[PDB]
Design a binder for these strands. Sequence first.
RNA 1: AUAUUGGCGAGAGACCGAUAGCGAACAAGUACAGUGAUGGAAAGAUGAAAAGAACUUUGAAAAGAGAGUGAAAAAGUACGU
RNA 2: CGUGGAGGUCAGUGACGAAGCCUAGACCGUAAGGUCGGGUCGAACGGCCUCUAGUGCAGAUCUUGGUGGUAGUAGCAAAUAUUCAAAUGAGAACUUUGAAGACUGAAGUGGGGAAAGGUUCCACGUCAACAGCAGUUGGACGUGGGUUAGUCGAUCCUAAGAGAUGGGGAAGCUCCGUUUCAAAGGCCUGAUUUUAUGCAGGCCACCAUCGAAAGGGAAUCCGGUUAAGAUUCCGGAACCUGGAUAUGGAUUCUUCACGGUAACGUAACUGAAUGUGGAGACGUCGGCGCGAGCCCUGGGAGGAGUUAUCUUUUCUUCUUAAC
RNA 3: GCUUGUGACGGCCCGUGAAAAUCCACAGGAAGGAAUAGUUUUCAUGCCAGGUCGUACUGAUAACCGCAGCAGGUCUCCAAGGUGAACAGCCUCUAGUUGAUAGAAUAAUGUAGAUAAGGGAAGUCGGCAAAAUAGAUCCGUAACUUCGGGAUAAGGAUUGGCUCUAAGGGUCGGGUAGUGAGGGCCUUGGUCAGACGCAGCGGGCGUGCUUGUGGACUGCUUGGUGGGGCUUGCUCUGCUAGG
RNA 4: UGUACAACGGGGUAUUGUAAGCAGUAGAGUAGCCUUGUUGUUACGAUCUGCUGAGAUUAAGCCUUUGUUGUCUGAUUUGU
Length: 838
Amino acid sequence: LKKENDQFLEALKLYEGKQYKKSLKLLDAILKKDGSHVDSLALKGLDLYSVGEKDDAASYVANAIRKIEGASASPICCHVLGIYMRNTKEYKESIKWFTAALNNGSTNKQIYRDLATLQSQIGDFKNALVSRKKYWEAFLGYRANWTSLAVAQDVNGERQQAINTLSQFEKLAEGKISDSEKYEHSECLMYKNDIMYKAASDNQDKLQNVLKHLNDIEPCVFDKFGLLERKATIYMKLGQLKDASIVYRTLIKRNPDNFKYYKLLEVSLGIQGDNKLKKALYGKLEQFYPRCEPPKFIPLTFLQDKEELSKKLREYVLPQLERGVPATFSNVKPLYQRRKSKVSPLLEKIVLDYLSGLDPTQDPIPFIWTNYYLSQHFLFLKDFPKAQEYIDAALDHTPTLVEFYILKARILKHLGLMDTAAGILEEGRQLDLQDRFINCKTVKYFLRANNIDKAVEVASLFTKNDDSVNGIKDLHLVEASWFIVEQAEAYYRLYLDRKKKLDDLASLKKEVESDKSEQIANDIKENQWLVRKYKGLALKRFNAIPKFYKQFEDDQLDFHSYCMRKGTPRAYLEMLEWGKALYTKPMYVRAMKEASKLYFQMHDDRLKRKSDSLDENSDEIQNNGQNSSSQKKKAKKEAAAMNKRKETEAKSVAAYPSDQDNDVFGEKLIETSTPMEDFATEFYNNYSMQVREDERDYILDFEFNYRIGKLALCFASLNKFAKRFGTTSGLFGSMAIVLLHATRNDTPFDPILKKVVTKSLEKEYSENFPLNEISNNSFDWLNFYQEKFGKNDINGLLFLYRYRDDVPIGSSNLKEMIISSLSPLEPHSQNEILQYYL
RNA sequence: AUAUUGGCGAGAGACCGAUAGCGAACAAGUACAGUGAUGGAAAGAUGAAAAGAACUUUGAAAAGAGAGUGAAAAAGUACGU
RNA sequence: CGUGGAGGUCAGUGACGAAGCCUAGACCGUAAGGUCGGGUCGAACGGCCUCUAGUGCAGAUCUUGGUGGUAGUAGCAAAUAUUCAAAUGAGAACUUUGAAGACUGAAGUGGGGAAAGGUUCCACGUCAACAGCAGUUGGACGUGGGUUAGUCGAUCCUAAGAGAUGGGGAAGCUCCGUUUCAAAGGCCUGAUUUUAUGCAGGCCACCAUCGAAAGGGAAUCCGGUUAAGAUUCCGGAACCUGGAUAUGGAUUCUUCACGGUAACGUAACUGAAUGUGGAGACGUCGGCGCGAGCCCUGGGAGGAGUUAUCUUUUCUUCUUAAC
RNA sequence: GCUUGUGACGGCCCGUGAAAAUCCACAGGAAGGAAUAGUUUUCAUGCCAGGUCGUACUGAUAACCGCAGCAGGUCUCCAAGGUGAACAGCCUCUAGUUGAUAGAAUAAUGUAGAUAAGGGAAGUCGGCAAAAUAGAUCCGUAACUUCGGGAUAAGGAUUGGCUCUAAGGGUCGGGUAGUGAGGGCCUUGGUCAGACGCAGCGGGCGUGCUUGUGGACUGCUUGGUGGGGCUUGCUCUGCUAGG
RNA sequence: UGUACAACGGGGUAUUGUAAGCAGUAGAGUAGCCUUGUUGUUACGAUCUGCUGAGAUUAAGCCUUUGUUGUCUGAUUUGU
């Protein structure tokens, strides 16, 4: 060990700059003479990972790791390994390697800052505080160190220490602040105010001191919105009402279009009990802002007189109908969610009286806007023929509006006509090809109309077309979600339709002379193969949204240092909250539920087709053999044609690169080994570790914990659901019946778990569900359910129909009851349930 | 008043044009061969101007694949056509 | 008909490109030849009437220069001889190191030299050309350093030889001769107190020069120090020549010494011209005596190796100069 | 036992087998000289200088010459141990090389060596080429002749290894008894050059290191505070310092 | 995947010729000596005899062998 270290030191400068081939050549020349060099292998792994290679880089890194016994080597190798782990989404190993390097003897304090970022990604703040303290004591000439120390002491719990540190820093640097460093300083001041907020509590002297400090720093703080908000909060936490009212009036003068400021002023003034005071206040404020909308929308929520309410509604709808806004119904969208038989008749009467005095030629714009508003109002009131008549009259009057076509497509979708709606919306979109919202709506409605190829062809227009025949790669690079969700649902519907198709084809079973279904089977086989391939592609596309969220969370590497260098601690806390709440999105929950349903269906049908029927030799023959008719050449030609078609299909639906993911066909995802383990270690642990209290889907947790052998979690979730959302829901009774049928000794599980669940049920719910009817086969649970919770619930009936194999409570009677109970709903939902859910 | 391929200083061609013209248009009594009196050559002009190759990659290099200079490098120093 | 050049003309053409080259492209002329078109390529060139020749191509075993069949054949066969492990690298039948196995079998394939080569010896880096294969190797390439004399030679003298003046012939470049019909030169004493070294005398005639770095010859070694020089440098000890000059010894009033019969001796113990003698100075063959070196061997003091069996065992060190 | 140098020698000649420079000696007698000192530096010591040019390497199947690193030509001193008359032929030590494109089959035909049953030159222009004979001692040895030769003529007999026998030399020595020198005198006793030199209690010359104690800076389980900003957790310049 | 084959070893058989090592009052005779002898012994001593009718090879172009050790798919080319 003499010349190899010199060559490594002379080649390290190539990696330090912007050189890769010259360093790789030197590493190869070194390894050609001695292959047992750990530093050279560790550098070559990172060099191959930084240029594009993945397999060779991982192999070299694994070899370098295996060629290490103790923790006593050069710190450069450990630093390179830490960089590699940081670049390969490995935080624990990177932290361990950096700690081992710093424990050996490194004179580079900046490495400590790296740890201050790494642990900042895993939440380990106990050692992060010490790392920040060391990195601050190492260099005393940058405000980023002070900001990082303040943030670390505020997040942990050292509030007084952070206040003292900020005070000492401001005393030492009083007057030595440049111009560009003023704003940041102001931001820091605001952050200190936030710290003082944590020292506010309910003490009078503390709040007075915070108010005095805020009034003293007001001439120095540049941010005025947050300053005035904190001032109003302090005034509300004390007792001064006039000063708080003045602050809120100043905020309104700064920005009148804000419902939050108006609500806070209403709460501060204490006039929420009397209606005349609020009426006079809003009538006086209307003269100050005649062009706003909250001052005219909020007073429509506490009116009791019918004549006054009608007059206010008329004065609110007259300017909107005169100027013509594409959101008039939106302006009354939330009110319709809270009022109905009391407000909607008066609004309809006013609109009819206004329309009876208009003219289709003198005032065409108010005429068409009144027609659109009437169509919206009737569509909201479950009316369809009159809405279609109004939209047809509007199209005949002025066929140059996209909103009319959008409303027609929405009505046709609500009436179960998806294809006609897609056709009308495409025809309307072809009128002007410059808007993207209408294109996205058309693609979504085509995906909802069992039309995927045309939807993709329409979407492949505004996308960047380079190394692909369509724009699927561009749609995946712009970070999409709704498109994938809407396309996977169409794939699932098309796959479920094939089940009914095969059932109808097998119901004949070659009845008498039925050679038509026997002589024609190649097309059916090709259609089934295509449907299976698209179903696999759907499962492949499902593995994207969680991966996208993981990539978004991992891309916060340089942000931990940027938020401290630029001086944005409040933005850092906001980013932390955003990263913690990432797993609380509705689209994420929907995608996770769909993935769970798919995995459970795959587990079920795999365990069903594993050991069933008989004669495997007569079933594993398939085709590719016509006896004495050249079977080898025929099978070879068939395989060649299938491969040639699959290559073109994969190039058409190309989304992921070939060097990044080889599972393009998706055959390995639909035939995995442990689906439940993968779903728990990839899709469930994150949602379990990052979740609130009231926002928690108990149905998905119950479905996940049912088929694993753990019933205590099921009982806890059921108890929490009954305590939160009450006990008068059909879902509670359905889950209780499912649990009672699962605790039967006939089902192969754990007798101890069944016994403890039975004891818990007998101890908790003793006068709700008969727990002594598990031995009688004549007791019908459907009658008891419809007597207690009733048959009007749809979610409970859907859950009982989904879990009917393990709970024998009938089938035909349940289906008839569901059909009879679905009638007071919308036709499209009824059709979808009868076609797929039933 | 006559002679003058040697030497210095000048003006010219119906003269050959570099395998010629004096042996030599260049490091031409140079190198080279012989102990000798002596014999005695071959070798021009890339490009207006080196501005003749910064830089990437392959290769241990030589050099190649580029890029680029440059009217034009089927003008790259073994170079007018 | 074609080419070099010149006079007149077409107010000729031409880098929006000529000359030249290629053209299983065409046209004209019986033919020597000319014209256009496509590519090359870049600087000047063509027709008409005449004039001026260093004016035409296939070989003259013609000259210069370049290139094929042979042919990737012939051939890389004497001096009895190579293998294994590590290092330098892209590359070890060929390099270096280690272990062997072998040659010269000491009138050596070794140490030093006279010719002869003239920086080829040595260090660093280096493989484009040389080492008829290969090569990171070299007496190859580029950059640098390296040759110390009183004791060696040299220098000088001379033999066999060459040769210049005085002279003799040749028109002459020059031939003979060189002590031969040549009145040819330096060398010691005395003068001194203008003499500085000239002169008043005794006198000797040798007769020019060059030429044998193994002929003769005034003078030394020891040990070590360099990537190369060692008898030259370093430390020590002597010898020869030349010129200065003092000390002591010896000699003397038997002024230039004694002893031994003798051959001769004792540390010095006046002295020139001239003459004489000796050294210098010398054949081969064969033996004898002596000395030195080489070689063998004993005692004794060390070091190395054997030891299935045995050997007071086999080898090596124990040296001394010039004076 | 080998090489070299030297001295007297024996034979050789109608070849009897070199100069000069330079030095030394003798004959000779010119000239000079004494001691109150004049000579003597061919006696020993004491002073200075000896100039100029060569100096490396090769001296050869690679450094010279043969158009090239070409089994060709080039002089001189040195050189061991064993067999062996021998400086030959063979093996080895000191010393110098491992370099002369390499490997595998290893068939014709060739280069360099041989083997060859019986006959034997009959082969060929010719036994030229091969092999024989051929190392040391002995017997024997013709014709001829210029009587010196022929003559190792021809022809043959022995010739290994171990252990023994006889022979060819030198250097030494020719008495007993009384005496002197035992010119070795050992030894017992000393006389006084019995010195030079072995070793120690030692002294000086500074000085080589520590236990136990007045002190010192940098530091810690840290007890307690001049001040500032937060007007509570808290922050900073810090400070008197108990141990 | 096999009474298949290869390298060793056991033999059959052949070439040469009685080894290595020890022992023997063997050994032509010679020295040291001591109780000096009716075999006196310590060493030198070419050789002779006893195991040796073994020892050296036994295969490259001889024969066999369930013994020992193993091997058993490295690439190219083909059509009326």
